[PDB]
């Protein structure tokens, strides 16, 4: 005495949808991150312009993996050099390598960081 | 465009939902904006009524 269709349209009723509870994982183990910190940062740039970036703009110039984004570059530089960075500019070179201009924090000097890296 | 007859944009009330319905009648000569037209069996014999 209460089943009333107040609409002239029949819609498909909402039925239960269960989440997957697989009996075996389709892959035995998660494959490891290939784009780790050592993969992200390949080698620094030691050219004339890169040297001018270090002395003037407090910026370290690196060649990085083309898949890494600015957040990954920022974290990778921070971990494996123990420095704080301000911002990361990024271009892709005409030969296909990604280049990152990593400006350092004001309390970090890009000159002696490049000295301990070994690219002075 | 492409039609010589002007079109009339007429607004009715939906009898089942709180909403306004806009029709695109073919304008009968003599009808003006701000005029009431009446559509139905019991509508009177006036220009523009249906």
């Amino acid at each position: 005495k209460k089943k009333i269709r107040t609409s002239p349209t029949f819609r498909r009723p909402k039925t239960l949808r269960l989440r997957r509870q697989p009996k075996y994982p389709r892959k035995s183990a998660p494959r490891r991150n290939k784009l780790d910190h050592y993969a992200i940062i390949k080698f620094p740039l030691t050219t004339e312009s890169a040297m001018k970036k270090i002395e003037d703009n407090n910026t370290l110039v690196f060649i990085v993996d083309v898949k890494a984004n600015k957040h990954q570059i920022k974290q990778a530089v921070k971990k494996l050099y123990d420095i704080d960075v301000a911002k990361v500019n990024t271009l892709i070179r005409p030969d296909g390598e990604k280049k990152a201009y990593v400006r350092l924090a004001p309390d970090y000097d890009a000159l002696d960081v490049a000295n301990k890296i070994g690219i002075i | 465009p492409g039609r010589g007859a002007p079109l009339a944009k007429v607004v009715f009330r939906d009898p089942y939902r709180f909403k306004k319905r806009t029709e695109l009648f073919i304008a009968a000569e003599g009808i003006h904006t701000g005029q009431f037209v009446y559509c139905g069996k019991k509508a009177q014999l006036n220009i523009g009524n249906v």
């Binding site: 269709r5 609409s7 002239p8 029949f10 | 009898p15």
Partner: protein, 241 residues
């Protein structure tokens, strides 16, 4: 008494062009899914068309009282389940190891199920009562059964629910069951059922065999004819004086 004067009735008017219509029942005018419309138009077609007596004979089923008595009797000879049979087999095995290997309990009388099983019992005249469901999905599985049952003199009834027969045989659906043999104390109950069955199915087989079904128009068409005949009845009323 303490009725607030601020309270008042607000009677809305559902005339044409007046206040918006209420949310009333529209089931009569719903665009139903295709499968719902198909199975409803199928029912209407079974009323429009002239149904041959072989198919129309299954619309005459047992009444509520007789079907209840029949299934009450059939419940006593309900076939054993898997766990019942396994328990019986286990008991026979333990008895046999101790000192048995006999006493088959005569294979006590049971309800025989299945159209292939039942039709062979009828041909051999080993069936005492045959119960046929009225809603077999292809009707070809049963249309020969009523004529065969009378030809062999086996009393047959049509009951409503192939699911009801299936519930006896511990399955979803049974087409037809049969009482082959009955216990001594239930012989009187079966005899009362059989005599009630014969007078309704076997004895009036010529009427059943010649009784076409369907051929009934819709209520709208019947009403149109009715008001035309009523108008012509007034026309003949003025024709006479």
């Amino acid at each position: 008494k303490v009725v607030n004067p601020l309270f008042e009735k607000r009677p809305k008017n559902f005339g044409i062009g007046q206040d918006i219509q209420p949310k009333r029942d529209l089931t009569r005018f719903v665009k139903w899914p295709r499968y719902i419309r198909l199975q409803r138009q199928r029912a209407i077609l079974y009323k429009r068309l002239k149904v041959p007596p072989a198919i129309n004979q299954f619309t005459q089923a047992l009444d509520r009282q007789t079907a209840t008595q029949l299934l009450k009797l059939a419940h006593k000879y309900r076939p054993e389940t898997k766990q019942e049979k396994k328990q019986r087999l286990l008991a026979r095995a333990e008895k046999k190891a101790a000192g048995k290997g006999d006493v088959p309990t005569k294979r006590p009388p049971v309800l025989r199920a299945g159209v292939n099983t039942v039709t062979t019992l009828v041909e051999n005249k080993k069936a005492q009562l045959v119960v046929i469901a009225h809603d077999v999905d292809p009707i070809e599985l049963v249309v020969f059964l009523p004529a065969l049952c009378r030809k062999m003199g086996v009393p047959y009834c049509i009951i409503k629910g192939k699911a009801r027969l299936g519930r006896l045989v511990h399955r979803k659906t049974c087409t037809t069951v049969a009482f082959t043999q009955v216990n001594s104390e239930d012989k009187g109950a079966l005899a009362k059922l059989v005599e009630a069955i014969r007078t309704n199915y076997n004895d009036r087989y010529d009427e059943i065999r010649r009784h076409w079904g369907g051929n009934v128009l819709g209520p709208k068409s019947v009403a149109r004819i009715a008001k035309l005949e009523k108008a012509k009845a007034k026309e003949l009323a003025t024709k006479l004086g």
